[PDB]
Amino acid sequence: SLGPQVAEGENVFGVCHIFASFNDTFVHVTDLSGKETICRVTGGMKVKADRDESSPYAAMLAAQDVAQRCKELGITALHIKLRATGGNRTKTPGPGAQSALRALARSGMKIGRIEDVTPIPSDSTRRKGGRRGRRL
RNA sequence: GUUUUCGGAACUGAGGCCAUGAUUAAGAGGGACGGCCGGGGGCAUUCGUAUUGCGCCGCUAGAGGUGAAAUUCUUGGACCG
């Protein structure tokens, strides 16, 4: 918890993978390589209602919790790596990333380079469902 | 009583004469030639993510899914990286 780094002159970088879908949000922060984690909280950690766990407020609360964890641990700067569901399902990010980014910026956590890293397919396998789709 | 004018017809050779003898190349068709064009066809080769499973590492109690839930998988480490 104690380290010989310079606070005023420079800063410490990590990366944070924000995976947001239409069912859940994932605010995961690691080191610069991504091999070694820092803290991982999700939209199920803050709200116990299973209706809206991909809600913006749950993602906001999880982002404030992981920002407090990185502040008490000693991480000052973050590189945002945004992610959707990917694959053959969808490409639009979920309704938690917009609140999660603003909650990460509002807490005093400095933001470096932001990027969308989602799995894009070059015509992968068949999507779940019939030929006529899911009729509702 | 020979052999003639008393004469009915197939075939071949030499020369001359013919206005010597073949209508066109269809905004018909076929074919040749030259420069190309094309997710046209067959065979071989090569690449790109994505999906699933498995191996290892890290921290965590939820993850998936729905209009809403459960069946489903989870401290024997799920999900995410």
Separation of A86 CA and B69 C1' (Å): 26
CB A95 within 8 A of CB A133: no
d(CA A44, CA A63): 12
Looking at the DSSP assignment, which residues form a beta bridge with residue A115? A81
- Which protein residues have any CB–strand B distance under 7 A? A 17, 19, 21-24, 26, 28, 30, 34-37, 39-40, 42-45, 49-51, 53, 83, 86-88, 119-125, 136
d(CA A112, CA A43): 24
CB A50 within 8 A of CB A29: no
d(CA A71, CA A58): 20
DSSP state of A95: T
Determined by which method? cryo-EM
Nucleotides in chain B near protein beta carbons (<7 Å): 48-51, 57-70, 79-81
- The position carrying tokens 């410490």 is A12
Resolution of the PDB structure in angstroms: 3.6
For A15, other C-beta atoms within 10 Å of its C-beta total: 21
- The position carrying tokens 């709200």 is A47
